[PDB]
Amino acid sequence: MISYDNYVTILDEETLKAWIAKLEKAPVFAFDTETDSLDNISANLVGLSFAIEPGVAAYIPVAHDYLDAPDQISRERALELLKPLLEDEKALKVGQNLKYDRGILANYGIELRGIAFDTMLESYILNSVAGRHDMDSLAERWLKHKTITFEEIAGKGKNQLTFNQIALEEAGRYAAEDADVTLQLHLKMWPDLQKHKGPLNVFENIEMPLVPVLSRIERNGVKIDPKVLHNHSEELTLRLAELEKKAHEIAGEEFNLSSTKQLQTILFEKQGIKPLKKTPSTSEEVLEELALDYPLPKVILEYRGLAKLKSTYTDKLPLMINPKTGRVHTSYHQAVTATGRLSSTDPNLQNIPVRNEEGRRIRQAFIAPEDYVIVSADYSQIELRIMAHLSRDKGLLTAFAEGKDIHRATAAEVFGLPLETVTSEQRRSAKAINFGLIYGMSAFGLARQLNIPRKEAQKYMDLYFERYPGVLEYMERTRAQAKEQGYVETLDGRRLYLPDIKSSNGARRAAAERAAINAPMQGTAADIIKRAMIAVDAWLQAEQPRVRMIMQVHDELVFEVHKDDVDAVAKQIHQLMENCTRLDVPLLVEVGSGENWDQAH
Ligand SMILES: [Zn+2]
Ligand SMILES: [Zn+2]
Ligand SMILES: [Zn+2]
Numbered sequence: 001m002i003s004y005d006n007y008v009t010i011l012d013e014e015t016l017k018a019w020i021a022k023l024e025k026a027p028v029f030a031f032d033t034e035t036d037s038l039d040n041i042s043a044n045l046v047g048l049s050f051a052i053e054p055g056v057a058a059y060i061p062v063a064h065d066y067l068d069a070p071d072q073i074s075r076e077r078a079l080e081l082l083k084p085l086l087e088d089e090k091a092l093k094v095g096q097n098l099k100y101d102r103g104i105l106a107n108y109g110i111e112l113r114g115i116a117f118d119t120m121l122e123s124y125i126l127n128s129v130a131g132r133h134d135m136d137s138l139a140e141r142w143l144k145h146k147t148i149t150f151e152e153i154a155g156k157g158k159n160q161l162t163f164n165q166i167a168l169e170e171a172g173r174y175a176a177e178d179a180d181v182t183l184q185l186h187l188k189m190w191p192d193l194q195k196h197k198g199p200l201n202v203f204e205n206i207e208m209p210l211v212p213v214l215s216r217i218e219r220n221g222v223k224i225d226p227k228v229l230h231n232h233s234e235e236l237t238l239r240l241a242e243l244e245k246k247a248h249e250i251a252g253e254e255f256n257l258s259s260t261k262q263l264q265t266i267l268f269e270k271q272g273i274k275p276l277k278k279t280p281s282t283s284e285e286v287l288e289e290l291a292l293d294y295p296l297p298k299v300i301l302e303y304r305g306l307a308k309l310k311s312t313y314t315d316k317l318p319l320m321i322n323p324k325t326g327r328v329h330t331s332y333h334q335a336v337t338a339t340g341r342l343s344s345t346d347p348n349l350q351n352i353p354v355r356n357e358e359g360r361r362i363r364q365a366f367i368a369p370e371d372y373v374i375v376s377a378d379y380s381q382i383e384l385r386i387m388a389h390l391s392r393d394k395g396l397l398t399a400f401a402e403g404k405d406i407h408r409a410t411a412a413e414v415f416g417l418p419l420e421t422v423t424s425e426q427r428r429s430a431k432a433i434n435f436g437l438i439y440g441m442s443a444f445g446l447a448r449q450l451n452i453p454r455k456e457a458q459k460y461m462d463l464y465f466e467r468y469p470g471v472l473e474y475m476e477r478t479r480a481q482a483k484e485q486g487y488v489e490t491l492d493g494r495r496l497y498l499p500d501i502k503s504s505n506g507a508r509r510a511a512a513e514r515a516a517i518n519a520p521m522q523g524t525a526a527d528i529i530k531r532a533m534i535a536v537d538a539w540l541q542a543e544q545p546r547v548r549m550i551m552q553v554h555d556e557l558v559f560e561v562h563k564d565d566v567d568a569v570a571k572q573i574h575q576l577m578e579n580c581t582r583l584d585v586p587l588l589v590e591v592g593s594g595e596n597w598d599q600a601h
Contacts, residue, residue, distance in 0.1 A: 002148060002173050003173070004169045004173070006055075006057075006173070006176065006180075007057050007058055007172055007173065007176030007177070007180070008058045008059070008172075008176075009058070009059050009061065009168055009169060009172045010058050010059065010060045010061075010073070011061070011070065011071065011072055011073065011168075012073065013073060013077065013081070016060060016073060016078065016081060016082075017081065019050065019052075019058055020081060020085060022052055023050060023052060023085055023091070024085065024091065026052045026053070027092070028092040028093070028094055028116065028117065028186070029050055029051065029052050029091075029092070029093060029094065029183070030050065030051040030057070030093070030094045030095060030179045030180070030183035030186070031048070031049070031050055031086075031093045031094070031095055031101070031179065032048065032049040032050075032095060032096075032175060032178045032179045032182065033045055033047070033048055033049075033100075033101050033104045033105070034046050034047045034048070034049070034163045034171065034174075034175050035104055035163060036063075036162040036163055036164045037162065039322070039329075040100060040103045040104065040107075040215075040218065040219060040329070041103075041107070041219055041221075041322060041324055041325055041329060042322065042323075042324045043107070044063060044107075044164075045062065045075060045104050045105075045107070045108070046061070046062065046063045046064060046162075046163045046164045046171075047059060047060055047061040047063065047064070047163070047171065047175060048060045048062070048078065048082065048175075049172075049175035049178060050179055051176070051179035051180045051182065051183045053183070054180065054183060054184050054187065055180065056180075057176040057177070057179040057180040057183075058176060058179075059168075059171065059172035059175040059176045059179075060073065060078055061073075061168050061171060061172070062075040062078045062079075063075050063164055064163075064164050064165070064166065064167075064168055064171065065164050066164070066165045066166075069168070070168060072168070079108055079110065083110055086105060086110055086111075086112055086113075087110060087111055087112070087113050088113060088114055089113040091114045092114050092116040092117070093112070093115060093116060093117075094116065094117040094118075094119065094182055094183055094186045095117070095118060095119070095182055096118065096119045096120050096135040096178065096182045096185075097120050098112075098115050098211050099211050099212075099214050099215045099218075099334070102115060102212050103215045103218070103219055106215070106219065112212070115208065115211050115212055116208065117186050117190065117208070118207075118208065118211055119135070119138065119182050119189065120134070120135075120138075120334070120335050121133075121203060121207045121208065121211070121334065121335060122185070122186065122189040122190065122193060122203065123138055123185075123189065123335070124207070124335035125193065125199045125202055125203040125207060125494070126189060126192060126193060126199065127495075127497050128335070128337070128338050128339075128340065128495075128496065128497075129338050129496070129497055129499075130497075133335040135178065135181060135182065135185070136149065138185050139181050139185065142184075142185055142188050142189065143181065143185065143188070147177060147178075147181055148173060148174045148177055150174070152174075153166055153170050153171070153173075153174045154166065196493075196495075197493065198492075198493025198494070198495060199493060199494070199495060200493070201492060201493045202340075202490075202492050202493050202494045202527065205531075206492060206494075206527055206530050206531060206534070207334070209534045210334065210530050210533060210534055211334075212537075213533050213534055213537040213549075214332050214334060214342075216537065216549070217332065217533075217549050217550065217551070217552065218329050218330065218331065218332060219329065220548045220550055221322070221325055221327030221329040221330075221550070222327055222328050222329075222330070222366055222550045223326075223327050223328075223366070223367050223368065223369055223560070224317055224318070224321060224327070224328050224365055224366060224367070225365050225367050225596075226317075226318035226321060226365075228361075228364060228365040228367075229313075229317050229318050229365045230318065232314050232361055232365070233310065233314045233315060236306055236309075236310045236314060237310075239306060240303065240306060240307060240310070243299050243302065243303045243306070244257070246299050247296065247303070250295060250296045250299070251266050251270065251296065257300050257303050257304065259277060259278075259279070259287075260276045263276065263300065264276055266296070267290075267296065267297065272290060272294070279304065283445065283448045283449075284448060287301050288301055289451075305356075305358070306358065309353070309358055309359070309362070313347065313352060313362050314362070316347065317347060317362075317365065320346060320347060328347070330344055330345070330346060330347055330349060330551070331344065331345045331346050332344055332552065338496060338515070339518070339519050339522040339523045339526060340490070340496075340522075340523045340526040340527065340530075341522060341523075341525070341526035341529070342526070342529075342530070342552060344553065349551060349553040350553055350554060352553075354554075360598050361598070363596065363598035364596045364597070364598040364599075365596070366551075366558075366596055366598070367595065367596045367597075368595060368596065369560065371562060371563050372546075372560045372561060372562055372563060373560070373561055373562075373563050373566060373593050373600070374550075374558060374559070374560060374561075374593065374594055374595070374596055374597050374599065374600045375547075375558070375559045375560070375561045375566070375569070375570060375573070375591065375592070375593045375600055376556055376557075376558055376590075376591065376592045376593070376594075376597070376600035376601050377556060377557045377558075377559070377573045377574065377577055377589055377590070377591050378555055378556035378557075378589065378590045378591075378592075379525070379528065379529070379555040379556070379577070379587060379588070379589060380588045380589070380590050381406065381555075382525045382528060382529075382555050382585070382587065383438055383522065383525050384396075384406055384434060384435075384438070385400055385585055385586050385587060385588070386491075386520075386521045386524045386525060386585055387438060387471070387474070387521050388400060388586070389491075389585045390474050390491075390520060390521065390524075391468070391470040391471045391473065391474035391475075392470045392474075393468050393469075393470035393471060394470075395409075395413065395467065395470075396409075396468060396470075396471075397586065400588075401586065404419065405427075406434065407427045407428075407430050407431040407434060408422045408427050408430070410430040410431075410433070410434055410464070410468075411426040411427050411429065411430035413467040414429075414430055414433070414460065414464050414467055415429075415430075415463075428450075429450060429452075429460060432446055432449050432450045433446060433460055433461060433464050436449070437517070438517075438518060438521050439514060439518055440475075440513065440514035440516070440517040440518055443455075443457050443458045443461050444457065446460070446461065474517075475517055478516050478517050478520060479513055482498050482501050482512070482513070482516035483501050483502060486498060486499070486501060488519050489523075490519070490520055490523035490524040490526075490527055491520075491524045491527065491582060491584065491585070492524070492527040492531075492582075494524075494526075494527055496515065496516075496519035496520075496523060498512045498515060498516055499512075500512040501513070501516065524582075524585070525555060527582075528582055528585070528587070529552065529557075531580070531581045531582070532557065532576065532577045532580070532581050533549070533557065535576045535577070535580040535581065536549060536557065536573060536576045536577065537549060539576060545562075545565065545569055545572075546561065546565050546569075547559050547560065547561045547562070547565070547569055548560045551597075556601075557573075558600075559573070561593070566593055570591045570593065573591060574589050574591050577589040
């Protein structure tokens with residue numbers, strides 16, 4: 001178990017000051033905060049926990065207020081006494097998801113420095129795919145110990161308690177164990193993180209410095225016009241009604257716009273061919289093939305998409321606005337992807353359609369406050385630029401070197417014709433090939449995205465590898481070391497472990513071969529992006545210009561910049577991104593500005 005004996009509950013200044021003194025000479029210490037809510041900007045600190053050594057940890061309750069809650073040190077007094085320590089860059093702290101913690105402190109004008117070790121990130125850099133990187137999963141894996149779960153002390157469902165309603169001693173068992181367990185996890189993982197200079201570098205210079213930048217980006221939030229969102233909502237109801245009428249009008253009677261039920265009984269029953277089309281999907285979409293001549297499938301296609309988008313963003317978004325800030329604060333996840341790229345949720349900015357008009361309207365709702373503008377800094381096909389570098393191809397490298405559209409250069413060489421004459425269908429065939437390589441796409445998969453016959457696709461790829469031989473080598477070389485060492489790495493050292501590389505299973509090992517070729521390019525993009533955020537954020541913190549970094553999505557960073565400052569700030573973001581990262585990959589940053597995210601994008 002864990003009883004009231006394990007950890008102390010600090011209820012008086014004299015004891016806190018005693019701990020503070022010990023904390024000041026500890027080589028590194030684990031620190032934690034407990035709040036009344038998951039919402040960072042509006043949560044109130046209910047208490048703090050520390051651990052100076054395994055088994056030696058304490059819980060400092062400051063704001064429990066249930067009926068008859070014992071006297072506690074006031075939140076204001078505990079913070080003023082703890083502030084010097086917390087803001088000391090020299091006092092090294094350890095924690096699980098320090099991002100959340102740094103933010104809560106910032107609610108009180110305290111700047112958490114010495115953000116040295118985050119056990120979540122230690123775990124993530126050691127092996128991103130080992131499993132879940134949360135403390136409960138970690139403790140069970142490295143310490144064969146099952147931690148006290150939040151549900152165990154608070155409950156479940158709607159009648160779940162908030163931390164401030166939990167008895168002091170129960171609150172302490174949970175809090176103090178978090179502190180203690182975190183320290184123990186660091187003591188086991190930190191040594192391991194040193195057997196390799198690759199992972200080490202990434203964790204030290206990329207992941208750790210990013211913890212406070214993510215916090216600031218999350219807390220800053222993004223201004224969303226709910227009116228716009230609402231109009232778009234009303235209009236999408238009218239358009240969904242019209243499309244339903246247009247579907248009924250093409251044939252007869254009423255029916256749902258669901259395949260393998262109401263569509264097949266119409267579509268093929270009135271000529272076409274039997275099978276359906278899955279919503280597997282991004283490889284064979286029977287519905288959009290007919291769409292070139294057939295009208296009905298076209299309207300069902302465009303219908304579903306609009307219905308998805310409406311409930312996903314148009315209806316969801318306005319409800320995410322925070323009463324306290326009046327802005328939306330998305331959740332970025334640093335230890336979730338296998339390759340190392342930041343993911344996002346509530347909302348998942350990365351699922352907002354790009355090459356589609358309706359997604360563009362979603363983006364128009366992402367607006368700049370009065371006297372400011374949204375500025376978009378993007379890494380133009382950074383992953384393609386990464387592949388050129390990693391494959392040491394003079395062709396590709398030169399295409400970018402002289403500012404040429406790699407898709408048209410590629411086709412100009414693959415199809416053998418002048419660059420100014422390359423057709424849209426050729427540029428489109430080249431691009432399908434270019435992008436297929438990154439994802440390690442099969443010659444048949446390429447045939448499925450391009451709609452050409454098999455072996456016709458195999459013809460194109462053969463021509464590609466002969467004109468760009470350095471790419472075949474890279475591809476093979478990567479599938480080689482991936483089998484040998486069981487992992488692949490990015491330019492900075494980040495690793496992706498491939499456990500099924502020698503699987504003995506067919507498709508499971510194929511997946512591992514695709515991930516192998518892919519990860520090095522994606523992971524490197526991720527590293528480049530993280531390094532850029534740190535760099536730009538460092539300029540922001542030091543120089544304090546009139547700019548806020550508000551989003552990170554795909555290969556772009558989004559800001560709000562003062563309208564009178566646009567030019568000088570844009571020159572700067574441009575230099576920080578294409579120069580203060582990796583000087584080995586030929587990078588290009590496209591900077592745009594507007595009144596909303598769509599205008600700058
Ligand atoms: Zn915590
Ligand atoms: Zn905790
Ligand atoms: Zn893998």
